Amino acid sequence: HHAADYVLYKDATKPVEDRVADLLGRMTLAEKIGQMTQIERLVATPDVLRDNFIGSLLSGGGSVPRKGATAKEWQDMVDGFQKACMSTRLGIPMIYGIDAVHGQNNVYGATIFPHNVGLGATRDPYLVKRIGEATALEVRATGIQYAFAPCIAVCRDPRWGRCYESYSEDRRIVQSMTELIPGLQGDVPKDFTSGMPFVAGKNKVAACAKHFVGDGGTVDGINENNTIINREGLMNIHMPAYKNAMDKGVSTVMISYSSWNGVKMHANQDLVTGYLKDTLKFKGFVISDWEGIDRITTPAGSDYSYSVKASILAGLDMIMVPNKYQQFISILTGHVNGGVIPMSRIDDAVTRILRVKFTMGLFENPYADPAMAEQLGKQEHRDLAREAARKSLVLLKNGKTSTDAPLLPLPKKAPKILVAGSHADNLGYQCGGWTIEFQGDTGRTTVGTTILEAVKAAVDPSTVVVFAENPDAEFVKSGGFSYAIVAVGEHPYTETKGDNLNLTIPEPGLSTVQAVCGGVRCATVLISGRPVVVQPLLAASDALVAAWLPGSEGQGVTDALFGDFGFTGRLPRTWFKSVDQLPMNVGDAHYDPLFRLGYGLTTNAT
Numbered sequence: 001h002h003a004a005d006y007v008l009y010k011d012a013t014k015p016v017e018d019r020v021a022d023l024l025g026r027m028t029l030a031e032k033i034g035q036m037t038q039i040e041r042l043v044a045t046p047d048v049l050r051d052n053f054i055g056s057l058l059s060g061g062g063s064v065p066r067k068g069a070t071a072k073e074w075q076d077m078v079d080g081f082q083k084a085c086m087s088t089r090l091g092i093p094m095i096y097g098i099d100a101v102h103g104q105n106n107v108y109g110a111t112i113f114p115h116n117v118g119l120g121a122t123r124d125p126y127l128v129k130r131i132g133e134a135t136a137l138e139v140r141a142t143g144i145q146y147a148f149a150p151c152i153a154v155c156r157d158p159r160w161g162r163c164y165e166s167y168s169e170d171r172r173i174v175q176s177m178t179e180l181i182p183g184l185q186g187d188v189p190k191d192f193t194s195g196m197p198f199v200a201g202k203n204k205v206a207a208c209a210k211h212f213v214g215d216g217g218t219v220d221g222i223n224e225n226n227t228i229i230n231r232e233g234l235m236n237i238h239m240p241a242y243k244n245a246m247d248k249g250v251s252t253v254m255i256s257y258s259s260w261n262g263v264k265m266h267a268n269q270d271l272v273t274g275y276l277k278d279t280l281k282f283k284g285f286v287i288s289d290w291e292g293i294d295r296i297t298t299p300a301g302s303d304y305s306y307s308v309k310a311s312i313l314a315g316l317d318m319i320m321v322p323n324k325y326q327q328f329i330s331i332l333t334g335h336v337n338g339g340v341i342p343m344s345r346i347d348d349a350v351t352r353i354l355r356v357k358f359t360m361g362l363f364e365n366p367y368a369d370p371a372m373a374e375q376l377g378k379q380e381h382r383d384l385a386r387e388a389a390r391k392s393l394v395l396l397k398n399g400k401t402s403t404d405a406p407l408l409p410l411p412k413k414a415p416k417i418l419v420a421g422s423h424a425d426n427l428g429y430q431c432g433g434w435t436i437e438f439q440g441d442t443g444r445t446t447v448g449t450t451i452l453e454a455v456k457a458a459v460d461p462s463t464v465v466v467f468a469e470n471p472d473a474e475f476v477k478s479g480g481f482s483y484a485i486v487a488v489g490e491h492p493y494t495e496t497k498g499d500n501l502n503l504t505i506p507e508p509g510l511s512t513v514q515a516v517c518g519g520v521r522c523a524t525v526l527i528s529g530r531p532v533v534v535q536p537l538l539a540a541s542d543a544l545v546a547a548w549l550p551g552s553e554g555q556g557v558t559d560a561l562f563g564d565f566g567f568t569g570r571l572p573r574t575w576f577k578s579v580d581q582l583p584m585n586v587g588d589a590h591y592d593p594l595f596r597l598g599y600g601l602t603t604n605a606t
């Protein structure tokens with residue numbers, strides 16, 4: 001269709017499937033295996049990307065061009081990599097992925113939204129969609145085209161370090177929150193075929209339903225471990241939200257490090273190809289987790305040739321290597337040259353990768369848009385995060401006896417108030433893991449508003465606000481305070497570092513609450529990724545709020561404390577009486593919660 005030098009795959013007016021087939025038919029084996037290879041930015045250079053025909057790059061958690069990098073620094077990084085990829089013989093653009101899992105959370109100055117457990121507390125799928133919309137914009141601000149989200153794990157044991165990445169122990173809530181997908185990618189057309197990939201264009205991102213399947217069902221919440229459940233339970237609890245993701249056109253699916261009845265997901269042909277591809281009719285691409293193929297073996301990485309065979313034959317399309325690309329490419333080439341992996345499997349993987357890249361517009365807009373840089377941390381997005389944070393809060397207690405005056409909402413005008421606790425003026429702690437660093441961090445790590453700063457911004461000008469991180473009882477009794485707001489809870493964590501069998505918060509936390517509440521009426525704000533042992537905190541406190549990991553906009557917390565809005569959040573998980581009960585989920589025969597799933601007290605706006 002025209003010029004002498006016309007190449008059909010480069011023609012934007014042609015159907016995606018025609019462009020895929022036209023390009024596939026031109027590729028060498030090295031070109032094909034290169035599309036299946038994703039590498040870390042830390043190992044990428046122009047020559048590596050060209051010479052190995054690389055298909056994708058990622059930033060792992062904390063993998064940034066430099067601390068404090070601007071949106072344009074990110075765009076320039078990504079474009080540098082893309083220029084190299086575009087300079088190959090076929091000029092296939094790379095796709096760049098990142099964990100934008102509560103905002104564009106690796107990036108300094110990005111809006112940090114509540115983590116998923118708090119989002120579940122909102123029961124507001126439209127809010128979550130709008131969060132997906134804002135997050136796409138902040139990701140494209142940085143030149144990145146692909147977010148490894150949503151995590152649609154259904155966490156069945158809060159001892160898991162990734163429980164905060166699950167919207168709920170109730171699959172029905174997780175299913176509802178799959179609205180993140182069309183937020184991130186755009187809404188699918190009216191005609192759309194379930195399982196096809198979809199991204200609207202250059203102002204949206206490819207999404208990733210993860211981690212397939214039963215990541216949230218592992219024994220004792222041990223991360224990456226075995227999920228022991230019959231097929232009926234897998235399909236009833238862990239699978240449903242993947243079908244909603246198909247219906248919404250999720251572009252990619254990432255495989256779980258976990259096993260199902262002792263079979264590594266990364267080696268599970270029956271589920272990856274038999275179920276996801278052949279039964280759900282998924283037509284986007286399937287990506288490994290980080291060194292997920294390595295971890296098929298024990299020790300990990302001890303037979304990488306077998307890891308490559310098993311994973312590729314199972315149906316994986318793209319391998320998050322992410323470092324040892326030369327070994328991956330060599331081994332895979334060897335297996336194909338040997339007949340161990342058929343060209344048909346290679347061609348299927350490449351068809352799927354290309355289908356996503358053409359669908360999303362990546363061949364038409366391979367480079368960043370500098371005009372999008374100002375989306376990063378935009379105030380409209382922060383207002384959205386503030387709404388989400390406030391909606392996420394679950395009021396557990398509001399008065400020690402039935403006859404007491406309710407403590408919340410608090411008055412904005414009082415002579416002197418106390419704000420205390422380890423978590424009252426610590427932005428990193430209120431964001432939790434996957435913020436700036438992989439594991440999160442402590443202190444003022446990005447742009448945001450701490451609880452203390454929020455209180456100062458809310459109160460009447462006549463109200464004196466005193467901060468004391470860990471005051472003793474006498475200090476409180478002597479201070480002439482009207483009330484105190486005390487914030488405590490978990491430190492940031494991610495993945496296996498968060499696995500925790502006792503679920504008690506670090507000290508000083510309880511001791512501070514006890515000292516404060518012992519001297520003045522107190523509202524305790526509990527920052528956590530999950531339910532934690534709470535009876536002692538409750539016994540001490542007049543009011544207690546489960547604020548989860550509310551992100552960068554601490555004013556969401558004070559919006560509800562001071563009565564600008566009423567408390568509306570409801571527990572998305574069971575709150576256990578003790579960890580010896582676990583696992584214990586809504587609907588179990590032996591259900592004895594401290595607070596059941598769906599519990600939450602309310603207030604009315606002042």
Ligand SMILES: OC[C@H]1O[C@@H](S[C@H]2[C@H](O)[C@@H](O)[C@H](O[C@H]3[C@H](O)[C@@H](O)[C@H](S)O[C@@H]3CO)O[C@@H]2CO)[C@H](O)[C@@H](O)[C@@H]1O
Binds near residue numbers: 060061148290
């Ligand atoms: O981020 C991509 C997908 O990967 C994993 S998280 C992944 C971190 O992103 C990555 O930084 C981290 O690398 C560490 C290795 O685990 C360690 O074994 C070595 S010593 O060092 C680096 C620490 O720099 O590895 C993590 C996986 O363990 C998630 O499961 C996915 O949800 C995420 O999309």
Ligand SMILES: *[C@@H]1O[C@H](CO)[C@@H](O)[C@H](O)[C@H]1NC(C)=O
Binds near residue numbers: 222225259
């Ligand atoms: C589960 O973790 C145990 C305890 O660390 C370990 O020995 C085992 O290999 C793990 N199982 C799987 C399937 O990951």
Ligand SMILES: *[C@@H]1O[C@H](CO)[C@@H](O)[C@H](O)[C@H]1NC(C)=O
Binds near residue numbers: 603604
């Ligand atoms: C809050 O509003 C509800 C619904 O009208 C009402 O029934 C309740 O009495 C109100 N409580 C307070 C403290 O204002």
